[PDB]
Amino acid sequence: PSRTELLAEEYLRREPQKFRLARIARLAVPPAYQDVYVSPDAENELQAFGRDAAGRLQYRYHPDFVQAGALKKWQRLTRFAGALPTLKVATTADLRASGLPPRKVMALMTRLLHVARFRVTYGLSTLRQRHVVVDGNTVTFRFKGKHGVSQHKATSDRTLAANMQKLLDLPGPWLFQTVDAGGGERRRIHSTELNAYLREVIGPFTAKDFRTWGGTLLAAEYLAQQGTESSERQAKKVLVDCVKFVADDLGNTPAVTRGSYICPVIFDRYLDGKVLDDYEPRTERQEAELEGLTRSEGALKRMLESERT
Numbered sequence: 001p002s003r004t005e006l007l008a009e010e011y012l013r014r015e016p017q018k019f020r021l022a023r024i025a026r027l028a029v030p031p032a033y034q035d036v037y038v039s040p041d042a043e044n045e046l047q048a049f050g051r052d053a054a055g056r057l058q059y060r061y062h063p064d065f066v067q068a069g070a071l072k073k074w075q076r077l078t079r080f081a082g083a084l085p086t087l088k089v090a091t092t093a094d095l096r097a098s099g100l101p102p103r104k105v106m107a108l109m110t111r112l113l114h115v116a117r118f119r120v121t122y123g124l125s126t127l128r129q130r131h132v133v134v135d136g137n138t139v140t141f142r143f144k145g146k147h148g149v150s151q152h153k154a155t156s157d158r159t160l161a162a163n164m165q166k167l168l169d170l171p172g173p174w175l176f177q178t179v180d181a182g183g184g185e186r187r188r189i190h191s192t193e194l195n196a197y198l199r200e201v202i203g204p205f206t207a208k209d210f211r212t213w214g215g216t217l218l219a220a221e222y223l224a225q226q227g228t229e230s231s232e233r234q235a236k237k238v239l240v241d242c243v244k245f246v247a248d249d250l251g252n253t254p255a256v257t258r259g260s261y262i263c264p265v266i267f268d269r270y271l272d273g274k275v276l277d278d279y280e281p282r283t284e285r286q287e288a289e290l291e292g293l294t295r296s297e298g299a300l301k302r303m304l305e306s307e308r309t
Helices: 003-008 022-026 073-095 102-116 158-168 191-202 207-226 232-250 254-261 265-271 284-288 295-305
Strands: 012-014 034-038 046-051 057-061 132-135 138-144 150-156 177-179 186-188
Touching (some): 073 102, 102 150, 102 158, 102 191, 102 207, 132 158, 207 232, 207 295, 232 254
Antiparallel strands (some): 138 150
16 A cells, blocks of 8 residues: 555544544644545654645644754654554555556665765766666666766666566667556656655655665664774774775765764763674564564664663
């Protein structure tokens, strides 16, 4: 199902009465909106959704996402991790579609933003057919990104490779195209269209969250692999190395990477001798809270959660 369809089996339906307190009224959801679902849980990032007068989805978010500087980076990232399982459901629904309809191509792109940390010189939405090489199940991207910075990313996925091969069957130069069955109607997917799709599937989170989350996860994995250091001087040197590694991956400078991409909580922990491993669930309940996340993703979520009071 789609995100809203998945949440429709959970959310309260607006009838002016609600059916399966003052928080809902504060959202000020326009009364003329149709099939309005509102959250029974106060914590949900998506607090309300409904259809406007043109049959378009409209959203009201938790005030924490609209208030100026309401969330620390670690808070935003833990909430983002909570949104990943739902994202996986939504993109799969679109990927099961036949051929190359717009939503399927955008789902493919979204998956690439997630797994490879691309930005939306080139970014994901401006890739050309020359920028991708498919060898069996391996898809390798090589392009010059923002400020001419290197981006080299390889992923192995049968359905990704198969879909990439379908795209490469179309006339170039552009990579991400949607086409009808006959072949006569073909156009590019542009950044505006993709960003709109992201609003649906991950809103209030944005494409940037894939890179802050992904950068933080890559950093945490890097540190876990290197292992802790006894010397403070040495441990801090490892942090500098880690920033360089992640910066190279993300196509950023080290300064911007440490400043904005790697959540510094992971560095605080490392300097105190703690890594991803140390944050694995210790009960069934804890593992259940991490449903839909990978081992590494779940461990990162718990590490970030350790910042809570």
